[PDB]
């Protein structure tokens, strides 16, 4: 039985992304998804009754959802350029994250800062691949990654670095009370 419609073909000259750039974008999509899964594990850790840091839990669950949105934005960009008419199933793979426990809020913030730092470096490498391909400099995608993605990365790194510095100063003598107060401030609660 004929369950589908015989495909039609329309002009394709407008579809211009080159392979190296497209492959770097596909790899970045998997990286964003991997980051969302690692943040979910951080949210889960701080949600435990024996850890009980709801401010940190919410911070990381929010970060997980944001990374999922980053992956979706990259996928939407490829679709807009005429890609992903096939090879969609292989774009992503969900796997358990590498780390599932942290000693305290400082370790988690420093790990998040390092993850963001890795993502920033990876995006800069996608930009290089897309800009320096000898056959096609993808001006628009390079601009999009630079003005949207890197913008979010640098602001995010500075935010995490500041949080880590502020909380770490409290650790030599005020580990419990310092983290407790900092955690409630993440929820907008001034004790």
């Amino acid at each position: 039985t004929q369950c589908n419609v015989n495909p039609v073909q329309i002009p394709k000259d407008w579809i211009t992304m080159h392979r190296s750039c497209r492959n770097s974008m596909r790899q970045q999509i998997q990286m964003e998804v991997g980051a969302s899964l690692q943040y979910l594990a951080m949210g889960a850790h701080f949600s435990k009754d024996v850890v009980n840091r709801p401010g940190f839990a919410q911070l990381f669950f929010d970060a997980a959802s944001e990374e999922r949105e980053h992956a979706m934005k990259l996928i939407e960009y490829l679709l807009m350029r005429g890609e992903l008419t096939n090879d969609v199933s292989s774009l992503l793979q969900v796997r358990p994250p590498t780390r599932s426990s942290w000693k305290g809020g400082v370790e988690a913030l420093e790990h998040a800062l390092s993850m963001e730092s890795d993502v920033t470096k990876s995006i800069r490498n996608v930009i290089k691949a897309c800009e320096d391909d000898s056959e096609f400099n993808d001006y628009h995608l390079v601009d999009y990654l630079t003005g949207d993605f890197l913008e979010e990365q640098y602001k995010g790194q500075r935010d995490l670095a500041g949080k880590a510095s502020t909380l770490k100063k409290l650790m030599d003598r005020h580990e419990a009370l310092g983290e407790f107060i900092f955690d409630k401030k993440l929820l907008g609660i001034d004790v």
Partner: protein, 212 residues
Amino acid sequence: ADTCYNDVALDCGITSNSLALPRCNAVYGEYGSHGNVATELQAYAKLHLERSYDYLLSAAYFNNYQTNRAGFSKLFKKLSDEAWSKTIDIIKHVTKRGDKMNFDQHSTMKTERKNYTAENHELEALAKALDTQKELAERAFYIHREATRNSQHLHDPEIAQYLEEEFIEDHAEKIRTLAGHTSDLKKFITANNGHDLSLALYVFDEYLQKTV
């Protein structure tokens, strides 16, 4: 009978030099001690997580320029967003009950292995969505039975009511909706030798845009 109060009395004694307080946690009703309910709930979060991304890829596929089915794409995007939201909700429930989430926990429910492919024609995609929603629904039935019927020493109506309220009621509606969509497509394909198929898929996609 170990209690949190007794742990405090013991550990807060001048004799002690630690404060373990093993019973001062949120575990009650022996949650996690008997049966598979605790591990099954963790594996249920994992199933929703995996399906959220499978649905996301289907939403992307239907939004490519050749397929360009905004209604089908919206249907899958909604399924993806709901499964993502449920993943977080289940993780929070696992910790609310005093357990900890393990992202590599497997279910004991014997479920066949069938890779999810996002590149499908409309009927195939709806059929797969229907099958995966039935699997999510039957997994909830399984955990519910494990919590209130399968093990003599385990009775956890908190997990049962949580599943009833947050998953079970809505599964019936989603499955009925998807089953109806497959019936509609089946008729477009078979009636009048399938002559109206291309126009029907267009009209059906427009209908999904208005009703999803």
